Design an enzyme around this catalytic site. Structure first.
Site, PDB file in Angstrom:
ATOM      1  CB  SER A 109       3.275   1.828   6.245  1.00  0.00           C
ATOM      2  OG  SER A 109       1.787   1.827   6.393  1.00  0.00           O
ATOM      3  CG  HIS A 127      -0.523   0.305   2.611  1.00  0.00           C
ATOM      4  ND1 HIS A 127      -0.060  -0.806   3.319  1.00  0.00           N
ATOM      5  CD2 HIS A 127       0.020   1.261   3.116  1.00  0.00           C
ATOM      6  CE1 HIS A 127       0.407  -0.338   4.451  1.00  0.00           C
ATOM      7  NE2 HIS A 127       0.353   0.969   4.291  1.00  0.00           N
TER       8      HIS A 127
END
Ligand SMILES: *[C@@H]1O[C@H](CO[C@@H]2O[C@@H](C)[C@@H](O)[C@@H](O)[C@@H]2O)[C@@H](O[C@@H]2O[C@H](CO)[C@@H](O[C@@H]3O[C@H](CO[C@H]4O[C@H](CO)[C@@H](O)[C@H](O)[C@@H]4O[C@@H]4O[C@@H](CO)[C@@H](O[C@H]5O[C@H](CO)[C@@H](O)[C@@H](O)[C@H]5O)[C@@H](O)[C@H]4NC(C)=O)[C@@H](O)[C@H](O[C@H]4O[C@H](CO)[C@@H](O)[C@H](O)[C@@H]4O)[C@@H]3O)[C@H](O)[C@H]2NC(C)=O)[C@H](O)[C@H]1NC(C)=O
Ligand SMILES: *[C@@H]1O[C@H](CO[C@@H]2O[C@@H](C)[C@@H](O)[C@@H](O)[C@@H]2O)[C@@H](O[C@@H]2O[C@H](CO)[C@@H](O[C@@H]3O[C@H](CO[C@H]4O[C@H](CO)[C@@H](O)[C@H](O)[C@@H]4O[C@@H]4O[C@H](CO)[C@@H](O[C@@H]5O[C@H](CO)[C@H](O)[C@H](O)[C@H]5O)[C@H](O)[C@H]4NC(C)=O)[C@@H](O)[C@H](O[C@H]4O[C@H](CO)[C@@H](O)[C@H](O)[C@@H]4O)[C@@H]3O)[C@H](O)[C@H]2NC(C)=O)[C@H](O)[C@H]1NC(C)=O
Lengths: 218, 56
Positions: free
Chosen positions: A173, A41
């Protein structure tokens, strides 16, 4: 990382920063001289040609002689699902190959489908937020976490910091979760916002993808 | 005049992904990414608007 503490300089010399023109946006791990691994992502809907990959970093705000900077040549995905947050892993091939030294080294990965059980002691780390509006870290932060099975699904590795509002936040992330020396997750998502103290943080389970990783890195 | 927008229509979402791509709200808070911002816009019941992309 909310509730963690400053890493020692170049403690985790496989930790990579991914940067666009505004600077850091995601973490990554060095898994071979010319390959880094991150979360799918992070690269979806961004211009991968603009991403610089920084190795060797410690404090993002400072001019560090240690750093090595690459660009991305190709990416490899494996059916990332944005709806369900599944297979949230990517491998980026660097347009060169790192020099291995004290500040930059390639991480160790588990064998395929090795499972952590409930209560395993790990470290997370990252240059993301220090807290809901305390802002992004300059200095790499680390955090002792525990693997948890409750409130997690089987296609994730989940962690929780017991007795504290701590965990991963925006900007972490793609950063590793390291457990007994080996790289077991890639930070993927939160729920209830950061450090809720209620829902465990979710990683992508690297051990599920090792055959796929190996099919790239030899 | 920059007509800055994000689409928050698929919101809310129980979970957010953890990338940092900041958004500066009309409340002068920095949201960490579109997901964290959009969950706040639906929770403001629509009175929270986008000032601009980036930090405040
Ligand atoms: C893989 O991709 C890598 C990353 O790519 C980038 O990112 C991606 C996303 C995409 O955007 C790409 O398009 C992008 O480039 C890529 O790495 C790139 O590669 C570029 C091309 O190879 C490179 O650009 C140029 O590099 C020139 C190097 O010259 C400088 O260094 C040498 C060696 O030191 C010197 O001899 C030169 O004089 C020069 O500068 C001066 O160097 C020394 C003095 O000689 C330094 O002194 C200091 O160091 C001492 C060491 O002992 C120490 O004592 C200190 O105290 C101190 O004295 C300084 O004086 C320095 N002067 C400076 C820095 O100002 C540059 O000359 C050239 O820049 C010039 O032109 C530009 C364009 O007009 C100007 O912007 C710039 O201001 C200059 O005028 C230019 O930068 C990139 O550096 C590099 N990018 C990175 C790392 O981000 C890889 O090449 C690629 N790999 C592959 C394909 O294999
Ligand atoms: C939070 O997490 C962290 C990290 O978690 C681990 O690591 C990550 C990456 C993941 O893999 C996680 O899954 C892991 O859990 C936890 O930190 C770990 O703590 C453990 C103890 O609590 C610890 O195990 C014990 O190690 C002792 C030996 O350690 C030496 O040597 C090793 C190898 O180098 C090194 O890892 C240690 O840090 C330590 O190193 C020496 O340190 C001293 C002090 O810094 C150095 O001396 C100074 O050096 C400078 C240098 O310039 C200068 O010279 C100064 O003058 C000098 O004083 C010295 O140089 C270092 N030596 C070297 C060679 O470098 C063991 O003795 C011990 O033994 C036994 O006991 C255990 C418990 O019963 C048993 O399990 C074990 O089998 C033995 O029986 C332990 O095994 C880990 O080393 C440590 N890991 C890391 C990466 O730091 C932390 O626990 C956790 N906290 C919480 C609260 O949950």
């Amino acid at each position: 990382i909310v509730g963690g503490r400053r890493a020692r300089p170049h403690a985790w010399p496989f930790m990579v920063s991914l940067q666009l023109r505004g600077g850091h946006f995601c973490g990554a791990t060095l898994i071979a001289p010319n390959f880094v691994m991150s979360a799918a992502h992070c690269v979806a809907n961004v211009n991968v040609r603009a991403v610089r990959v920084v190795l060797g970093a410690h404090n993002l705000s400072r001019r560090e002689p240690t750093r090595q900077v690459f660009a991305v040549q190709r990416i490899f995905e494996n059916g990332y699902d944005p709806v369900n947050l599944l297979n949230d892993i990517v491998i980026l091939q660097l347009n060169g190959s790192a020099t291995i030294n004290a500040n930059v080294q390639v991480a160790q990965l588990p064998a395929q489908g090795r499972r952590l059980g409930n209560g395993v002691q790990c470290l997370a780390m990252g240059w993301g937020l220090l807290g809901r509006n305390r802002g992004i870290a300059s200095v790499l932060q680390e955090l002792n976490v525990t693997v948890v099975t409750s409130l997690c699904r089987r296609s994730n590795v989940c962690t929780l910091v017991r007795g504290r509002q701590a965990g991963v936040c925006f900007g972490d992330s793609g950063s590793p979760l390291v457990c007994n020396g080996l790289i077991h997750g890639i930070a993927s998502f939160v729920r209830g916002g950061c450090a809720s103290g209620l829902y465990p943080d979710a990683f992508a389970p690297v051990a599920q993808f090792v055959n796929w990783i190996d099919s790239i890195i030899q | 005049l920059a007509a800055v927008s994000v689409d928050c229509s698929e919101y809310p979402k129980p979970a957010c992904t953890l990338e940092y791509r900041p958004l500066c709200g009309s409340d002068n808070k920095t949201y960490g990414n579109k997901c964290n911002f959009c969950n706040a816009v639906v929770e403001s019941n629509g009175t929270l608007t986008l000032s601009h992309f980036g930090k405040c």
